[PDB]
């Protein structure tokens, strides 16, 4: 009774793809071909946060738009004061291999995950001034690739065991576990409403997961290479994925399609980080070719370059108000571009 | 403004601590323990001492070594291997005595795949062969033969430069060096492969790593100064 199951699975998959094809009638590029402003944007650095020991893999902006967190290869979290290029905190990690860090929206906690299979929760604002590990999140059998904060006590994680997982900081237990990936999942993009989130995997198929119901609402194929990064559009209906095939794939959760692809002949390296502006007008993408090309989501093309890094651009983030964009690379330097 | 000047003073203290651990990191050579599950890697870390990542530490002649073993991983796709680029060398640990698919072929495939990995271009492998004893009670005993399903190993004999230090038996040495050059083919086909022979437990193994590293960086410097 397995052959019939495969038959039904592929039948419904192809009827899904036919439903998508019927739903899709026109592309987004030709919709917006009429207008073409902000064709060339200039954002000089003016801010370079130096002090990280080793290669930086992840960073996250604070909701206050002034405070930042970044993780380094040696196992060091640095809380930065972005406005004045200051170190706010220095957290030495138990595991010397971290590949994701996140900053709580409330500003009290920092999530930290890597090869240790754990997303460690550090409390920035304890009764004492010492950042302390308020809660280790264990239960993943693969390397933890991205754990973003849902709430002050509720968090979402993405690990190397093809399984994303919701967790409660109060109990530390994996709540409403959900897996739908065949290849391991490397990044998740959280919606502003904190009720949905989209995660990308080596399967080259993004998955939209509902927080409350806790199982896959929607799947998005379309990437010719491994997915490395994902950001969710501020409007709440779209999201962009950065990948090893040098293509930024912008899908929409509505209508189950790909809105656009952002690629060029010059770029052949992988895309390691992706973020959107405050209005989502610019798609800022990190590349393995020492460069952070600023693409224009609306203009269907690259509008600007954030070059100035001496190694692989591994992480970048646009602050909540969109005032500036931080960008971490492997040269141990994280530079803010305004 | 005194609050802001105190922001600077806290920044300076943090940066001083960061410089201290910068010196610590510079004075340390990172290693990546690698191998299969049936191998003796765990035994080795015990001699080193005497979640997902195991941060084993050991010091030899005032040289720190962080040998990192991946305990709980998917073992289907090695995408985290990109995170190891600064490692001095990656420890490849394989059980030589596979008896009579067979795990020698799987180990060879893993070694070839991790040798041809571009994330590890400037990375030298120091390969360890364990189960010298378990090879001894197999090849010398003769309960299981290697010629049963290997067409090769019959036209191959001990090389003239082979050094049988244990001297247990010519057959044992022949099989062991067949394993050695079977592994080294891939490496011979910027980086080096350092084959070593050992049993499950050995103190000299730790020293071996040091010696291997004392070559790698040296050459890495020789190539850096156009000396090699």
């Amino acid at each position, epitope marked *: 009774e397995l052959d019939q199951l495969r038959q039904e699975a592929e039948q419904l998959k192809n009827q899904i793809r036919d439903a998508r094809k019927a739903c899709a009638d026109a592309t987004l590029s030709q919709i917006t071909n009429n207008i073409d402003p902000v064709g060339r944007i200039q954002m000089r650095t003016r801010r370079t946060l130096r002090g990280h020991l080793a290669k930086i893999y992840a960073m996250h902006w604070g909701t*206050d738009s*002034r*405070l930042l967190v970044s993780a380094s290869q040696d196992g060091k979290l640095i*809380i930065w*004061d972005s*406005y004045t290029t*200051n170190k*706010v*905190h220095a957290i030495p990690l138990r595991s010397s291999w971290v590949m994701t860090c996140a900053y709580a929206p409330s*500003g009290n906690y920092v999530a930290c995950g890597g090869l240790d299979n754990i997303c460690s929760i550090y409390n920035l604002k304890t*009764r*004492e*001034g*010492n950042v302390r590990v308020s809660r280790e999140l264990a239960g993943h059998t693969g390397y933890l690739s991205c754990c973003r904060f849902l709430d002050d006590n509720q968090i979402v994680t993405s690990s190397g065991d093809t399984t994303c997982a919701l967790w409660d900081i109060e109990t530390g237990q994996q709540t409403t576990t959900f897996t739908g990936h065949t290849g391991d999942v490397m990044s998740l993009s959280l919606a502003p409403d904190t009720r949905l989130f989209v995660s990308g995997a080596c399967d080259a198929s993004a998955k939209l997961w509902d927080v409350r119901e806790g199982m896959c609402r929607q799947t998005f194929t379309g990437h010719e290479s491994d997915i490395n990064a994902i950001c969710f559009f501020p409007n709440g209906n779209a999201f962009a994925t950065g990948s090893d095939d040098a293509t930024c794939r912008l899908f929409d959760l509505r209508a189950d399609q790909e809105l656009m692809t952002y690629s060029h002949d010059n770029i052949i390296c992988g895309i390691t980080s992706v973020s959107f502006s405050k209005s989502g007008r610019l798609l800022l993408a990190g590349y393995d070719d020492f460069n952070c090309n600023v693409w224009d989501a609306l203009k269907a093309d690259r509008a600007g370059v954030l070059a100035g890094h001496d190694n692989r651009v591994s992480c970048l983030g646009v602050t909540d108000d969109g005032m500036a964009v931080a960008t971490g690379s492997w040269d141990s330097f994280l530079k803010i571009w305004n | *403004r*005194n*609050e*802001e*000047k*105190a*922001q600077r*003073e*806290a920044n*300076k*203290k943090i940066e*001083k601590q960061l410089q201290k651990d910068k010196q610590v990191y510079r004075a340390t050579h990172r290693l990546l323990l690698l191998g299969a599950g049936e191998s003796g890697k765990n035994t080795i870390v015990k001699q080193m001492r005497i979640s997902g990542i195991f941060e084993t530490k050991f010091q030899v002649d005032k040289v720190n070594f962080h040998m990192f073993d991946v305990g709980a991983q998917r073992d289907e796709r090695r995408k985290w291997i990109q995170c190891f680029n600064d490692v001095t060398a990656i420890i490849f640990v394989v059980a030589s005595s596979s008896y009579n698919t067979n795990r020698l072929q799987a180990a060879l495939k893993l070694f070839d795949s991790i040798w041809n990995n571009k994330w590890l271009r400037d990375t030298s492998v120091i390969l360890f062969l364990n189960k010298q004893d378990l090879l001894a009670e197999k090849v010398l005993a003769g309960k299981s033969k290697i010629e049963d399903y290997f067409p090769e190993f019959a036209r191959y004999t001990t090389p003239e430069d082979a050094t049988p230090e244990p001297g247990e038996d010519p057959r044992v040495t022949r099989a062991k060096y067949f394993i050695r050059d079977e592994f080294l083919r891939i490496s011979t086909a910027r980086h080096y492969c350092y084959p070593h022979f050992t049993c499950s437990v050995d103190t000299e193994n730790i020293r071996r790593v040091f010696n291997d590293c004392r070559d790698i960086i040296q050459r890495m410097h020789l190539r850096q100064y156009e000396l090699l």
Partner: single-chain antibody
Framework: VQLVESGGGLVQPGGSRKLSCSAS????????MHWVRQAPEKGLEWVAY????????YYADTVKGRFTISRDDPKNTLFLQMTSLRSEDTAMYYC??????????????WGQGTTLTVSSSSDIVMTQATSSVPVTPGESVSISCRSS???????????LYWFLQRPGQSPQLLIY???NLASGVPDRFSGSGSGTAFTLTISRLEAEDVGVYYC?????????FGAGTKLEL
């Protein structure tokens, strides 16, 4: 987080005393220590200040080289050496914690305190409207504070602090800078400042509001204190 203070007592004029402030249950290695003393019948006063790493050390204008301040992180202790004790040098001394990372809560926690009985310009003027007023419960209470300069720094940080310490006990912290309320105190408190005149507003009142308030600035560093408004029930 506990602070235990030791030393003090009857001292002959011109004497030297080693006041001690030990930290128990927490580590002060990243904490700046401020030696704010309480006058027995007047407002609080600051004399000395040491940074977390002892990089920056400040003293009051009245006591610049007379006092000596040291911190021992391994022992988690603060030592205050005082020489040539005059009859005026009597106060209810307190050791104050204050960490200065962005968004922190300066002057959050105060020690138990010690008493010390002794025998016989550029400084900003920090003034409050009144000193005492009878208050009925429930109705909103407004306290006015004034400074001889504009506390709104170019970065936008108006350095003002309220403490509202009950008589004869460790001062607390109510609000710091602008419209920033410590999670320990109830949300009913609020602060409003034009830039030179400032108002502390209290929506509802209970038994905890009884006591004297205090107003501090931090733009420059003389740490001038206000007169102090007393609320009695």
């Amino acid at each position: 987080v506990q602070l235990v203070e030791s030393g003090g007592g009857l001292v002959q004029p011109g004497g030297s005393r080693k006041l001690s402030c030990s930290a128990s249950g927490f580590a002060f290695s990243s904490f700046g220590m401020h030696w704010v003393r309480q006058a027995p019948e007047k407002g609080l006063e600051w004399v000395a200040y040491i940074s977390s790493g002892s990089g920056t050390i400040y003293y009051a204008d009245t006591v610049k080289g007379r006092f000596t301040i040291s911190r021992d992180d391994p022992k988690n202790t603060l030592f205050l050496q005082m020489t040539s004790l005059r009859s005026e040098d009597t106060a209810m001394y307190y050791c104050v914690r204050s960490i200065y990372y962005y968004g922190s809560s300066p002057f959050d926690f105060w020690g138990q305190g010690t008493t010390l009985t002794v025998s016989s310009s550029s400084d900003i003027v920090m003034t409050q409207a009144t000193s005492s007023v009878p208050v009925t419960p429930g109705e909103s209470v407004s306290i006015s504070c004034r400074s001889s300069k504009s506390l709104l720094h170019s970065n936008g940080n108006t350095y003002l602090y309220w403490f509202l310490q009950r008589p004869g006990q460790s001062p607390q912290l109510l609000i710091y800078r602008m419209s920033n309320l410590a999670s320990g105190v109830p949300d009913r408190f609020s602060g409003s400042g034009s830039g030179t005149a400032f108002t502390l507003t209290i929506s509802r009142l209970e038994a905890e509001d009884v006591g004297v308030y205090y107003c501090m600035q931090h733009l420059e560093y003389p740490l001038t204190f206000g007169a102090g408004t007393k609320l009695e029930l």
